[PDB]
Amino acid sequence: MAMEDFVRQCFNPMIVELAEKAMKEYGEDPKIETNKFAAICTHLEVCFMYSDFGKHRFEIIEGRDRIMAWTVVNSICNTTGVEKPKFLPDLYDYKENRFIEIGVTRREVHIYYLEKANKIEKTHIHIFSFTGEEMATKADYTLDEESRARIKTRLFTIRQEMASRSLWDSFRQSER
Numbered sequence: 110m111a112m113e114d115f116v117r118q119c120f121n122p123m124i125v126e127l128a129e130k131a132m133k134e135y136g137e138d139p140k141i142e143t144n145k146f147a148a149i150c151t152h153l154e155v156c157f158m159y160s161d162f163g164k165h166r167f168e169i170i171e172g173r174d175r176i177m178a179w180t181v182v183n184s185i186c187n188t189t190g191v192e193k194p195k196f197l198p199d200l201y202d203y204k205e206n207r208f209i210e211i212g213v214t215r216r217e218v219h220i221y222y223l224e225k226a227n228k229i230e231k232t233h234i235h236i237f238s239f240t241g242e243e244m245a246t247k248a249d250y251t252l253d254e255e256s257r258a259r260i261k262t263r264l265f266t267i268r269q270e271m272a273s274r275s276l277w278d279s280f281r282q283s284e285r
């Protein structure tokens with residue numbers, strides 16, 4: 110309940126609506142799976158932030174319905190030649206001409222990185238934590254230092270807000 114209020118109070122309403130929709134399409138109640146709700150919001154926000162700090166360098170795939178995501182991915186592949194992924198990535202980088210998978214973890218960045226790399230094949234991976242750590246494919250961080258730094262500050266602030274409201278301990282030990 111406190112976690113549900115936190116989410117509504119600290120994410121802009123478009124992120125909340127997107128996260129909510131996603132969950133109840135797949136039979137998940139955001140009032141029950143409150144840690145999941147908050148993680149979905151958090152990840153979505155990072156994806157939007159990462160896109161925004163780009164002229165139009167990044168195409169946003171996360172946050173669309175699957176029809177549109179797959180329409181976007183299909184369209185990108187036919188006009189670039191880049192191999193088509195098996196899972197929907199998060200962004201396309203039109204400068205580096207590669208898909209990006211964004212991860213946001215409350216565990217060690219190397220652990221989650223492995224877990225994503227294993228789950229994927231030419232998709233660039235960029236992991237962020239709530240501690241100001243990141244790990245990215247070939248240590249290529251894609252973004253400039255200021256953009257990365259704004260993302261990390263936002264993540265650390267979510268963490269501390271949660272901790273203000275005694276939600277961090279639950280959120281940290283849970284898993285999306």
Ligand SMILES: Cc1occ(O)c(=O)c1C(=O)O
Pocket residue numbers: 152171196197198199211212213
């Ligand atoms: C489903 C899912 O879970 C965690 C992520 O970081 C994702 O990007 C993702 C997805 O939409 O593919």
Ligand SMILES: [Mn+2]
Pocket residue numbers: 171197198199
């Ligand atoms: Mn995604």
Ligand SMILES: [Mn+2]
Pocket residue numbers: 152199210211212
């Ligand atoms: Mn992701």
